[PDB]
Design a protein around this ligand. Structure first.
Ligand SMILES: O=C(CO)[C@H](O)[C@H](O)[C@H](O)CO
Ligand SMILES: O=C(CO)[C@H](O)[C@H](O)[C@H](O)CO
Ligand SMILES: [Mg+2]
Ligand SMILES: [Mg+2]
Ligand SMILES: [Mg+2]
Ligand SMILES: [Mg+2]
Lengths: 283, 283, 283, 283
């Protein structure tokens, strides 16, 4: 269960190869965060012992996220999804990760053009029940990230994520919210946190255009006040798509730069988020 | 403990005489609220039995509020303050009221020009302990309303109000917040609710200029999200100074109309507030 | 140039057929709006005389909007695009419409998977000049609506829209903003309006989740203040997808109801927006 | 008229005596601001030659503000008001200041207990006309600052400020707004800027609780969007009562620290404000 402030490492590498891991860890120490979120584009390619040693040497904690590739979208190909998640779960555990979170129930770009069906949710629930048991056997948790309607048609709101978690009824699955998605989906941004309050262990603090937090349209005071009010003691992870490699940015509809450079995003956005966290007593 | 929506009868009556009481109860039923807040400007003159019958006949609940007159400000004249609050407490209880709230620790217009001192707080503590015991004997609670720096120099934030309630140590004093005062005093409006969460039983939903809720500078979404997040189950009371008699309006620095008339304030503000209450699941 | 308050007819109908036209117009009368916005998604299916007659009979102005079907995306099939727009232009004029607006430059759901090319914008420019010439021949104007990154990759912000319009050189193309889209795309929502200032004649007052204005995450005070500040005088139109036009469903990604029903949205959203327009003095 | 960013010197000193002036000007230099606002509350006590040399040495511009002492309130004692303003104006000019601004029309803490009257405003107009003449003779301008109802009963909104400027008919009096006061007085904070637009040349970017800008309740996005929309090119000045000049302490009502210290307000507030100025393109 994460604690404090962290950063999504896409700001310094989307590929967790050896130089990428080193560059992300160095950045994390520079900005003095408590944890990093490691994206696993290609789980088999990850050097678990290098990463584990980096994290322990520099007293850094970690979790991992992914989205399922189309060959393994849980809604329609659940056995492939179980297989893909078991690999990702095992890499996460081996490198010292405490959790695998993100769109672990489908992939960026699912859309049937109609509302989500019961059969789609049944497959997801089966995929998630299997994956959670494999996660508990390796001592880690699983996260369900609500994402906006355009990225996935199945889980877009805090309350939909909670409804999936109750179906499965596994102890070790938590909700993962993202203010960039909440800014589109939640009927008042605080409502996402409210609906998910019993299961919220992680939140992406991302600006409305994936740019510099504080300089967009997210209602930060509402967000931080509501987190304080529910007693949120999970992970506060900054996410910006700045200096994300172009072929992974184009995939999530980044057609133009989200901010000038890392030095605007991290120099303005991290102090802003940490000050707000202090202001509302989360620290 | 109060529950649901209510209205400060300021809008129809600042003198709770017999026809004022009738008019205010009539308005309450027209807007179909759950309770009214009766300002007790002159407690001795209140006809308790008349009001009690009005409330019971019409299945309305009620509480009362005041501020201490200068001859009885608790910080400097605790014995007079005690005498004044006993009369108010007894009139509140006799008319069927469930609490006496407001600036019961001081007066509107108190200012020494320097920070509140420990001797002032000792006097207030002694007054409040005596007042709360007298209220327990009559079966009612007392509320300590945080008001802004210009109205009183002693209790301006939820955290100061909580500190006083812990000093006194009495079970039947709760915190009373006001969004108009909070908009000035709280370092992030939701922090006043957070700080007072253990003790908060009543809140005035008043716009930043005492006009029409929804049409000023208050952070309504943060306020309602935070109230829902702490699980607030007490009273939601609209306060606007529209149609307040002139001499009372001047006492509170109303130098110009806050709003066009009651049509705007209750016709626009009450639906806005009840819609927000519904939006964030307080209903 | 449209003036006052209007509604996009998805409030009341999926399709602009004869029974849909009859019901939408009757509903617009009931709420005393000044204009309706008619989706022009199947031009050869619209009974223009039946619509024109209803407009005159009921003292109702109108304009039309569309997105281009993939067979005529200007980005890539410019010649098809020009010819589709000439037809839509002609039918807009025939029924009494005063402009054709929206995503007239491409698809709702158009995505190459990479950033837009100057060749794509070269084709759009050609399409738009040709179209604006034909619109001039029928006495109507064209509007270019900026939409978010997931619905189109070419024109996402007021500033992009303005650059396109300045390239084309037509006197009769205006910018059309939508608060739902700016909520995602603009770095501070008022920046969309500021950048579009010289050309902004139409805006969709659409909530962040396409639901009821005032009950999402859009920054309405900033929006209305900035519109007042720039002297906005064009049209103010609600857009809530209670009913979803079939040809654009896939791209609009409404997978679940945006609000309880049509009466919630007009009953709560329209007073809220009229009240904000009066609050900020909008012409 | 001023340009760029400045600070009210109460950030760094209580009194504009000689060691205060040295401390304030040295602090200003570390933050690289363009100007400082010097209180002019005991005009005979200001060493103008020492201040001027400090300002020119360190390439800092300056203006002054004050509130009138009760012996010289223009409402009631216009002849004394004129004589006090003539001396304040001369000292402002002698030290290199470019305007005298603030509550030049009355007192910080002035209240009759009743609403303002024509006789009061007629006296203010007579005083300001004489003052503006004397200001023109020394080559500086005068500002009228709207302050909230508790600090003064005469000029509380931008529209009231403008009305006084037009009642006086001078050509060298501007309007001075303050977000801390607008947060209470304006019916939507942008409305204060809108109403004052033709005359607005100076604004106090002060947080709702006089603390750190960005960490209170002011609607900064609406403020900066609206300032950009009207083409604001005047001074942008912080005002945080880290130190309280004793002559106005009673009226300003700072009873508890507004923030931890000058390092917090300037280290977090100034970058927030600069970044917002950049975001909305005032630069
Ligand atoms: O906001 C919109 C959806 O992106 C646009 O208004 C559409 O262009 C419109 O519905 C077409 O009728
Ligand atoms: O905001 C203010 C009053 O509350 C003004 O800035 C004062 O005029 C200033 O503090 C006087 O130096
Ligand atoms: Mg995320
Ligand atoms: Mg109150
Ligand atoms: Mg639209
Ligand atoms: Mg000021």
């Amino acid at each position: 269960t994460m604690q404090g402030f962290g950063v999504h490492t896409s700001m310094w590498t989307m590929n967790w190869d050896r130089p990428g891991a080193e560059r992300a860890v160095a950045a994390a120490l520079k900005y003095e965060v408590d944890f990093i979120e490691i994206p696993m584009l290609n789980p088999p390619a990850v050097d678990t012992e290098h990463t584990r040693a980096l994290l322990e040497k520099n007293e850094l904690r970690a979790l991992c996220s992914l989205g399922l590739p189309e060959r393994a979208w849980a809604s329609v190909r659940p056995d492939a999804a179980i297989e893909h998640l078991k690999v990702a779960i095992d890499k996460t555990a081996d490198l010292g990760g405490e959790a695998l979170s993100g769109v672990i129930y489908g992939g960026i770009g699912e859309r049937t053009g109609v509302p989500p069906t019961e059969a789609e949710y049944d497959n997801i629930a089966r995929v998630l029940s299997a994956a959670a048991k494999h996660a508990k056997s390796r001592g880690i948790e699983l996260g369900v990230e609500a994402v906006n309607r355009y990225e996935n048609h199945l889980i877009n709101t805090g309350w939909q994520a909670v409804q999936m978690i109750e179906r499965v009824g596994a102890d070790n699955i938590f909700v993962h919210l993202d203010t960039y998605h909440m800014n589109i989906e939640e009927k008042g941004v605080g409502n996402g946190i409210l609906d998910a309050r019993e299961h919220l262990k992680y939140i992406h603090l991302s600006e409305s255009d994936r740019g510099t937090p504080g300089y967009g349209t997210c209602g930060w005071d509402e967000i931080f006040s509501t987190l304080a009010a529910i007693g949120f003691k999970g992970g506060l992870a900054m996410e910006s798509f700045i200096n994300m490699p172009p072929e992974v940015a184009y995939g999530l509809a980044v057609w133009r730069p989200v901010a000038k450079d890392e030095e605007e995003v991290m120099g303005n956005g991290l102090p802003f988020l940490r000050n707000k966290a202090k202001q509302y007593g989360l620290i």
